[PDB]
Amino acid sequence: TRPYYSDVDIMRDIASGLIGLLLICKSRSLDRRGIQRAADIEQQAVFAVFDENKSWYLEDNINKFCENPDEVKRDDPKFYESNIMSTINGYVPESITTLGFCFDDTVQWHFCSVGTQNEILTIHFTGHSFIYGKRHEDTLTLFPMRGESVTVTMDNVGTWMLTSMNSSPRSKKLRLKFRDVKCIPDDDEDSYEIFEPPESTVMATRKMHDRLEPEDEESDADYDYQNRLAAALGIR
Amino acid sequence: VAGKPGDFGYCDLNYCEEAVEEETGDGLDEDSDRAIEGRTATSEYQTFFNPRTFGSGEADCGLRPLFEKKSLEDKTERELLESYIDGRIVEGSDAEIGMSPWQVMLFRKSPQELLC
C-alpha cells in the first residue's frame, strides 16, 4: 500500500481530497491485469481529519460562494468544528458498505490515517481480530505518509462494535455497525454476497470450475506451453 | 591432401582448456524479453545448404500431418515449467503408436540384431 497525493502542494492538497492508494505488487503478473494468486478483493479503511481552512478552496465557503454577508460564520467554534470532520470513502458520517465477509476470503486489508497529526494512531477491535506477523493479534497501529497493508481472513459469526478508547471526538462516534455470518461455508445459499463456496447442486457450470480445453493454469502464459524455464522473483 | 578421392584431414593444436561458459566481462546480456504468446509466424525459416548438390530437406521441415498444421496438442510435448514440483526419481511412463515418427537405427542382414 502506497497512498499517492499531489506533488505541487504538500499539506493543503491532501485536505482537498487529492489522495488515493497505489498497489505496488510483487511478481504475480499472470496476464495483462495480473491475476492475484491466493488473493481476492480489497477492503481499505481511511480516517483523515482535515479542515476547510487547510484546503486551497477556502474561498468557496464564506466569502465568494456565500449568501449571508451580514453574518459571517467566522471566529466561532460552531463553524470550526463543522469543518473538522473524519471521512471514510468520501463519507464523513458512516460508509455505505459493511465489513461482513465470509469463509475462504483471502483478502488484503489496508489502513491509513493521514492529516495534521504526527504520532501513531491505533484502533481497538472488540470481538474481531486479524492475522499479521505469523500470529493472530487483536488491534493494530498504522502510520501516516506511507500505507499499511495486511492480509486478513475475516472468519466470524455475530455482530459487535469496533470503537476506540481516547477522549470524546474520536472515541464516541468512531464505531462500526456490521453483521458477519457464515451459514454454513461462505453463506451463499440463502443470502446476498459476492462469493460462492459453492457446495450446492452443480449439474452444469458454477464456481471453482476451471476446465479449459488447452491448459487450465500453472505459473504464467509466456507461450502456448512456456518452454523457457526460469521463473524467479526478481534479480537472480 | 591427396591419397584417395574422398575427404581431407584437419590439423590439431594444443591450445587451452578454457570453457565457453558465462562471460566474465561486465555482466549484462542481449537476449529478448518476451515474444508475446500468439502464433504470428508464416515461414521465416533459414537455408544453409544448396538443393542442387544436397537434395531436399530445405523447405519440408516441421510439417507433420498430425498435430502441427492443425494447431493442436496430443500427448507428446508435455513439458511445462521446470518448477513443476522439482524432481525426485524418474520412472518412464508408457507410450502410444503414432508419437514417434522418425526412427533411424542400424541392423545386420544375418543375424537380425539391434545395434545402435
PDB file of N, CA, C and O in Angstrom, chain B residues 19-62:
ATOM      1  N   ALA B  19      36.747 -23.020 -20.963  1.00  0.00           N
ATOM      2  CA  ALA B  19      35.388 -23.367 -21.347  1.00  0.00           C
ATOM      3  C   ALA B  19      34.632 -22.138 -21.835  1.00  0.00           C
ATOM      4  O   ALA B  19      34.923 -21.003 -21.444  1.00  0.00           O
ATOM      5  N   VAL B  20      33.647 -22.375 -22.700  1.00  0.00           N
ATOM      6  CA  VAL B  20      32.834 -21.304 -23.265  1.00  0.00           C
ATOM      7  C   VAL B  20      31.599 -21.090 -22.399  1.00  0.00           C
ATOM      8  O   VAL B  20      30.471 -21.043 -22.902  1.00  0.00           O
ATOM      9  N   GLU B  21      31.807 -20.945 -21.090  1.00  0.00           N
ATOM     10  CA  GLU B  21      30.705 -20.740 -20.157  1.00  0.00           C
ATOM     11  C   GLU B  21      30.240 -19.289 -20.167  1.00  0.00           C
ATOM     12  O   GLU B  21      30.292 -18.621 -21.204  1.00  0.00           O
ATOM     13  N   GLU B  22      29.783 -18.795 -19.019  1.00  0.00           N
ATOM     14  CA  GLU B  22      29.309 -17.423 -18.928  1.00  0.00           C
ATOM     15  C   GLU B  22      30.464 -16.443 -19.088  1.00  0.00           C
ATOM     16  O   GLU B  22      31.579 -16.690 -18.622  1.00  0.00           O
ATOM     17  N   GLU B  23      30.191 -15.325 -19.755  1.00  0.00           N
ATOM     18  CA  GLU B  23      31.217 -14.316 -19.981  1.00  0.00           C
ATOM     19  C   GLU B  23      31.474 -13.531 -18.700  1.00  0.00           C
ATOM     20  O   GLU B  23      30.537 -13.081 -18.035  1.00  0.00           O
ATOM     21  N   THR B  24      32.752 -13.367 -18.358  1.00  0.00           N
ATOM     22  CA  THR B  24      33.133 -12.637 -17.154  1.00  0.00           C
ATOM     23  C   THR B  24      33.177 -11.129 -17.362  1.00  0.00           C
ATOM     24  O   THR B  24      33.349 -10.391 -16.384  1.00  0.00           O
ATOM     25  N   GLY B  25      33.026 -10.654 -18.596  1.00  0.00           N
ATOM     26  CA  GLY B  25      33.060  -9.225 -18.853  1.00  0.00           C
ATOM     27  C   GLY B  25      31.726  -8.567 -18.529  1.00  0.00           C
ATOM     28  O   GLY B  25      30.658  -9.074 -18.872  1.00  0.00           O
ATOM     29  N   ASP B  26      31.807  -7.417 -17.856  1.00  0.00           N
ATOM     30  CA  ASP B  26      30.636  -6.646 -17.455  1.00  0.00           C
ATOM     31  C   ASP B  26      29.673  -7.489 -16.628  1.00  0.00           C
ATOM     32  O   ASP B  26      29.886  -7.689 -15.428  1.00  0.00           O
ATOM     33  N   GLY B  27      28.611  -7.988 -17.258  1.00  0.00           N
ATOM     34  CA  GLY B  27      27.638  -8.808 -16.564  1.00  0.00           C
ATOM     35  C   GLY B  27      26.225  -8.650 -17.086  1.00  0.00           C
ATOM     36  O   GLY B  27      25.260  -8.995 -16.397  1.00  0.00           O
ATOM     37  N   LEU B  28      26.092  -8.129 -18.301  1.00  0.00           N
ATOM     38  CA  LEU B  28      24.804  -7.922 -18.944  1.00  0.00           C
ATOM     39  C   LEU B  28      24.657  -8.861 -20.136  1.00  0.00           C
ATOM     40  O   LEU B  28      25.587  -9.579 -20.516  1.00  0.00           O
ATOM     41  N   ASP B  29      23.461  -8.852 -20.725  1.00  0.00           N
ATOM     42  CA  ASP B  29      23.155  -9.744 -21.837  1.00  0.00           C
ATOM     43  C   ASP B  29      22.666  -8.971 -23.055  1.00  0.00           C
ATOM     44  O   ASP B  29      22.938  -7.773 -23.191  1.00  0.00           O
ATOM     45  N   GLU B  30      21.942  -9.652 -23.943  1.00  0.00           N
ATOM     46  CA  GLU B  30      21.452  -9.049 -25.176  1.00  0.00           C
ATOM     47  C   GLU B  30      20.294  -9.869 -25.735  1.00  0.00           C
ATOM     48  O   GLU B  30      19.949  -9.754 -26.917  1.00  0.00           O
ATOM     49  N   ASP B  31      19.689 -10.701 -24.891  1.00  0.00           N
ATOM     50  CA  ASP B  31      18.637 -11.601 -25.342  1.00  0.00           C
ATOM     51  C   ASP B  31      17.292 -10.882 -25.354  1.00  0.00           C
ATOM     52  O   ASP B  31      17.191  -9.719 -24.953  1.00  0.00           O
ATOM     53  N   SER B  32      16.254 -11.582 -25.811  1.00  0.00           N
ATOM     54  CA  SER B  32      14.925 -10.993 -25.846  1.00  0.00           C
ATOM     55  C   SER B  32      14.327 -10.951 -24.441  1.00  0.00           C
ATOM     56  O   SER B  32      15.003 -11.186 -23.436  1.00  0.00           O
ATOM     57  N   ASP B  33      13.035 -10.637 -24.372  1.00  0.00           N
ATOM     58  CA  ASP B  33      12.404 -10.427 -23.075  1.00  0.00           C
ATOM     59  C   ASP B  33      11.000 -11.017 -22.995  1.00  0.00           C
ATOM     60  O   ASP B  33      10.443 -11.126 -21.899  1.00  0.00           O
ATOM     61  N   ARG B  34      10.413 -11.409 -24.125  1.00  0.00           N
ATOM     62  CA  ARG B  34       9.040 -11.901 -24.139  1.00  0.00           C
ATOM     63  C   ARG B  34       8.773 -12.802 -25.338  1.00  0.00           C
ATOM     64  O   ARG B  34       8.734 -14.029 -25.194  1.00  0.00           O
ATOM     65  N   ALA B  35       8.568 -12.190 -26.507  1.00  0.00           N
ATOM     66  CA  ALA B  35       7.901 -12.803 -27.647  1.00  0.00           C
ATOM     67  C   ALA B  35       6.503 -13.246 -27.223  1.00  0.00           C
ATOM     68  O   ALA B  35       6.295 -14.368 -26.748  1.00  0.00           O
ATOM     69  N   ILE B  36       5.549 -12.333 -27.390  1.00  0.00           N
ATOM     70  CA  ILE B  36       4.222 -12.465 -26.796  1.00  0.00           C
ATOM     71  C   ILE B  36       3.556 -13.735 -27.306  1.00  0.00           C
ATOM     72  O   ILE B  36       3.708 -14.109 -28.476  1.00  0.00           O
ATOM     73  N   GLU B  37       2.860 -14.428 -26.409  1.00  0.00           N
ATOM     74  CA  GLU B  37       2.088 -15.620 -26.748  1.00  0.00           C
ATOM     75  C   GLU B  37       1.099 -15.271 -27.850  1.00  0.00           C
ATOM     76  O   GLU B  37       0.206 -14.443 -27.661  1.00  0.00           O
ATOM     77  N   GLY B  38       1.251 -15.911 -29.004  1.00  0.00           N
ATOM     78  CA  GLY B  38       0.402 -15.639 -30.145  1.00  0.00           C
ATOM     79  C   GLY B  38       1.067 -16.026 -31.448  1.00  0.00           C
ATOM     80  O   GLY B  38       1.960 -15.323 -31.933  1.00  0.00           O
ATOM     81  N   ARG B  39       0.627 -17.142 -32.028  1.00  0.00           N
ATOM     82  CA  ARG B  39       1.256 -17.718 -33.218  1.00  0.00           C
ATOM     83  C   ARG B  39       1.045 -16.800 -34.423  1.00  0.00           C
ATOM     84  O   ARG B  39       0.047 -16.868 -35.145  1.00  0.00           O
ATOM     85  N   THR B  40       2.028 -15.931 -34.636  1.00  0.00           N
ATOM     86  CA  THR B  40       2.048 -15.000 -35.761  1.00  0.00           C
ATOM     87  C   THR B  40       3.361 -15.223 -36.511  1.00  0.00           C
ATOM     88  O   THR B  40       4.269 -14.391 -36.471  1.00  0.00           O
ATOM     89  N   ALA B  41       3.455 -16.361 -37.195  1.00  0.00           N
ATOM     90  CA  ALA B  41       4.662 -16.716 -37.927  1.00  0.00           C
ATOM     91  C   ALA B  41       4.272 -17.497 -39.173  1.00  0.00           C
ATOM     92  O   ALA B  41       3.708 -18.589 -39.075  1.00  0.00           O
ATOM     93  N   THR B  42       4.580 -16.926 -40.342  1.00  0.00           N
ATOM     94  CA  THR B  42       4.263 -17.565 -41.608  1.00  0.00           C
ATOM     95  C   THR B  42       5.377 -18.542 -41.932  1.00  0.00           C
ATOM     96  O   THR B  42       5.281 -19.730 -41.566  1.00  0.00           O
ATOM     97  N   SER B  43       6.445 -18.119 -42.609  1.00  0.00           N
ATOM     98  CA  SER B  43       7.554 -19.017 -42.947  1.00  0.00           C
ATOM     99  C   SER B  43       8.839 -18.187 -42.912  1.00  0.00           C
ATOM    100  O   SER B  43       9.235 -17.588 -43.914  1.00  0.00           O
ATOM    101  N   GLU B  44       9.479 -18.162 -41.747  1.00  0.00           N
ATOM    102  CA  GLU B  44      10.723 -17.432 -41.532  1.00  0.00           C
ATOM    103  C   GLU B  44      11.880 -18.393 -41.287  1.00  0.00           C
ATOM    104  O   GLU B  44      12.729 -18.168 -40.422  1.00  0.00           O
ATOM    105  N   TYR B  45      11.923 -19.481 -42.050  1.00  0.00           N
ATOM    106  CA  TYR B  45      12.979 -20.469 -41.908  1.00  0.00           C
ATOM    107  C   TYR B  45      14.264 -19.981 -42.573  1.00  0.00           C
ATOM    108  O   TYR B  45      14.290 -18.971 -43.281  1.00  0.00           O
ATOM    109  N   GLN B  46      15.343 -20.719 -42.336  1.00  0.00           N
ATOM    110  CA  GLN B  46      16.655 -20.404 -42.881  1.00  0.00           C
ATOM    111  C   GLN B  46      17.092 -21.489 -43.857  1.00  0.00           C
ATOM    112  O   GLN B  46      16.505 -22.571 -43.932  1.00  0.00           O
ATOM    113  N   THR B  47      18.145 -21.181 -44.611  1.00  0.00           N
ATOM    114  CA  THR B  47      18.687 -22.115 -45.594  1.00  0.00           C
ATOM    115  C   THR B  47      20.196 -21.941 -45.642  1.00  0.00           C
ATOM    116  O   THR B  47      20.685 -20.836 -45.891  1.00  0.00           O
ATOM    117  N   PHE B  48      20.928 -23.028 -45.405  1.00  0.00           N
ATOM    118  CA  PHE B  48      22.385 -23.012 -45.414  1.00  0.00           C
ATOM    119  C   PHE B  48      22.971 -23.813 -46.567  1.00  0.00           C
ATOM    120  O   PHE B  48      23.890 -23.342 -47.245  1.00  0.00           O
ATOM    121  N   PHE B  49      22.461 -25.017 -46.812  1.00  0.00           N
ATOM    122  CA  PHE B  49      22.939 -25.843 -47.907  1.00  0.00           C
ATOM    123  C   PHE B  49      22.257 -25.437 -49.212  1.00  0.00           C
ATOM    124  O   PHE B  49      21.425 -24.525 -49.258  1.00  0.00           O
ATOM    125  N   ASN B  50      22.613 -26.127 -50.293  1.00  0.00           N
ATOM    126  CA  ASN B  50      22.046 -25.877 -51.604  1.00  0.00           C
ATOM    127  C   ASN B  50      21.256 -27.092 -52.070  1.00  0.00           C
ATOM    128  O   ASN B  50      21.722 -28.230 -51.906  1.00  0.00           O
ATOM    129  N   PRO B  51      20.065 -26.904 -52.644  1.00  0.00           N
ATOM    130  CA  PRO B  51      19.272 -28.057 -53.099  1.00  0.00           C
ATOM    131  C   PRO B  51      19.895 -28.766 -54.292  1.00  0.00           C
ATOM    132  O   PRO B  51      19.538 -29.907 -54.601  1.00  0.00           O
ATOM    133  N   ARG B  52      20.827 -28.098 -54.970  1.00  0.00           N
ATOM    134  CA  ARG B  52      21.466 -28.633 -56.166  1.00  0.00           C
ATOM    135  C   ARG B  52      22.391 -29.807 -55.880  1.00  0.00           C
ATOM    136  O   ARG B  52      22.320 -30.826 -56.573  1.00  0.00           O
ATOM    137  N   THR B  53      23.260 -29.693 -54.875  1.00  0.00           N
ATOM    138  CA  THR B  53      24.243 -30.725 -54.572  1.00  0.00           C
ATOM    139  C   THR B  53      23.957 -31.449 -53.261  1.00  0.00           C
ATOM    140  O   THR B  53      24.816 -32.189 -52.775  1.00  0.00           O
ATOM    141  N   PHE B  54      22.780 -31.258 -52.684  1.00  0.00           N
ATOM    142  CA  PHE B  54      22.431 -31.927 -51.435  1.00  0.00           C
ATOM    143  C   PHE B  54      21.087 -32.639 -51.501  1.00  0.00           C
ATOM    144  O   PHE B  54      20.918 -33.679 -50.858  1.00  0.00           O
ATOM    145  N   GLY B  55      20.131 -32.111 -52.260  1.00  0.00           N
ATOM    146  CA  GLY B  55      18.828 -32.733 -52.373  1.00  0.00           C
ATOM    147  C   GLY B  55      17.727 -31.935 -51.707  1.00  0.00           C
ATOM    148  O   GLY B  55      17.681 -30.706 -51.824  1.00  0.00           O
ATOM    149  N   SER B  56      16.829 -32.623 -51.001  1.00  0.00           N
ATOM    150  CA  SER B  56      15.728 -31.958 -50.316  1.00  0.00           C
ATOM    151  C   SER B  56      16.120 -31.589 -48.892  1.00  0.00           C
ATOM    152  O   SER B  56      17.291 -31.309 -48.616  1.00  0.00           O
ATOM    153  N   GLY B  57      15.148 -31.587 -47.982  1.00  0.00           N
ATOM    154  CA  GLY B  57      15.425 -31.243 -46.602  1.00  0.00           C
ATOM    155  C   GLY B  57      15.692 -29.775 -46.364  1.00  0.00           C
ATOM    156  O   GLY B  57      16.427 -29.427 -45.434  1.00  0.00           O
ATOM    157  N   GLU B  58      15.113 -28.899 -47.181  1.00  0.00           N
ATOM    158  CA  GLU B  58      15.297 -27.458 -47.053  1.00  0.00           C
ATOM    159  C   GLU B  58      14.017 -26.714 -46.710  1.00  0.00           C
ATOM    160  O   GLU B  58      14.040 -25.813 -45.868  1.00  0.00           O
ATOM    161  N   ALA B  59      12.898 -27.068 -47.340  1.00  0.00           N
ATOM    162  CA  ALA B  59      11.614 -26.427 -47.087  1.00  0.00           C
ATOM    163  C   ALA B  59      10.659 -27.313 -46.302  1.00  0.00           C
ATOM    164  O   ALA B  59       9.997 -26.837 -45.374  1.00  0.00           O
ATOM    165  N   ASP B  60      10.570 -28.595 -46.649  1.00  0.00           N
ATOM    166  CA  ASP B  60       9.687 -29.516 -45.945  1.00  0.00           C
ATOM    167  C   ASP B  60      10.292 -29.905 -44.603  1.00  0.00           C
ATOM    168  O   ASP B  60      10.964 -30.935 -44.490  1.00  0.00           O
ATOM    169  N   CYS B  61      10.056 -29.087 -43.578  1.00  0.00           N
ATOM    170  CA  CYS B  61      10.593 -29.339 -42.249  1.00  0.00           C
ATOM    171  C   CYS B  61       9.583 -28.878 -41.210  1.00  0.00           C
ATOM    172  O   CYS B  61       9.005 -27.795 -41.332  1.00  0.00           O
ATOM    173  N   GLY B  62       9.375 -29.709 -40.190  1.00  0.00           N
ATOM    174  CA  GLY B  62       8.448 -29.368 -39.125  1.00  0.00           C
ATOM    175  C   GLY B  62       7.005 -29.280 -39.564  1.00  0.00           C
ATOM    176  O   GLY B  62       6.237 -28.499 -38.992  1.00  0.00           O
TER     177      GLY B  62
END
